[PDB]
Design a protein around this ligand. Structure first.
Ligand SMILES: [K+]
Length: 254
């Protein structure tokens, strides 16, 4: 399946997400905005924790390349900088393109490793300029996308814009039922979020240029929602899977 889990490294331990990949789960991957899920970057994770799923590391910002920590061994995909367009660690497209040359060196085994673009918060021009400035031999295979909207029609139009603008297959690393437009109201009730997840996951499973996707909302601490509506939660304050989490983990849609 295409469906993954995001987990904030602010939680300090990867243990709580093991239960998303238990008997019957349809979820196939996970990421955490950083290099590894067991190690100094998630330092409280139990030594013996096993997560039977693909981990996708991220180079969060230019500084992460110099942090002296290692990428999760055996990675297949590497994600570029998180929301470098936001004032995320803010860079110009040229500052990002220069650091990209150093990041792209991590692809030492190019038959079994592929690079994914930086994901912008919103600035499509930022990403167009970035991709035009990097050397062609470093061009990412996949586009990373963050899409926060509240209606299925708007979701599909924006996904189609990213596909049409950039012409790469897509890894949707962050989505849920939330608009950062302030004239756009957040979900009215919990049911609307179940409905949104059903519609979006069916469309994403049926669209061949969607390689992977990842709902935003597996967290324990409310702080780690970053003002996302708590109706988007896949996990509660105690580390237990919510009804929305159950829907997601068992395939999102019939
Ligand atoms: K690999």
């Amino acid at each position: 399946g295409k469906a993954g889990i995001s987990w904030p490294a602010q939680e300090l331990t990867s243990d709580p997400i093991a239960k998303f990949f238990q008997h019957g789960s349809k979820l196939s991957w996970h990421w955490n905005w950083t290099k590894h899920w067991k190690g100094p970057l998630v330092p409280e994770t139990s030594d013996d924790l096993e997560i039977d799923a693909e981990f996708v590391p991220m180079i969060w910002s230019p500084q992460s390349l110099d942090d002296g920590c290692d990428l999760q061994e055996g990675w297949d995909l590497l994600l570029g900088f998180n929301e470098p367009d936001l004032d995320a660690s803010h860079r110009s497209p040229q500052e990002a393109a220069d650091v990209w040359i150093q990041l792209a060196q991590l692809r030492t085994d190019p038959d079994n490793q592929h690079l994914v673009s930086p994901a912008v918060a919103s600035n499509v021009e930022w990403l167009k300029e970035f991709l035009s400035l990097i050397p062609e031999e470093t061009y990412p295979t996949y586009l990373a996308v963050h899409l926060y909207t509240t209606t299925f029609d708007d979701f599909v139009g924006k996904m189609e814009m990213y596909h049409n603008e950039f012409g790469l297959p897509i890894i949707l690393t962050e989505f849920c039922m939330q608009s950062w437009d302030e004239g756009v109201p957040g979900p009215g009730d919990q049911q609307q979020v179940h409905d949104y997840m059903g519609q979006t996951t069916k469309w994403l499973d049926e669209t061949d240029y969607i390689i992977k996707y990842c709902w935003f909302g597996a967290v324990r601490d409310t702080a780690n929602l970053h003002d996302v509506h708590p109706f988007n939660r896949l996990m509660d304050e105690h580390g237990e899977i919510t009804p929305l989490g159950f829907q997601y983990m068992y395939g999102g849609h019939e």
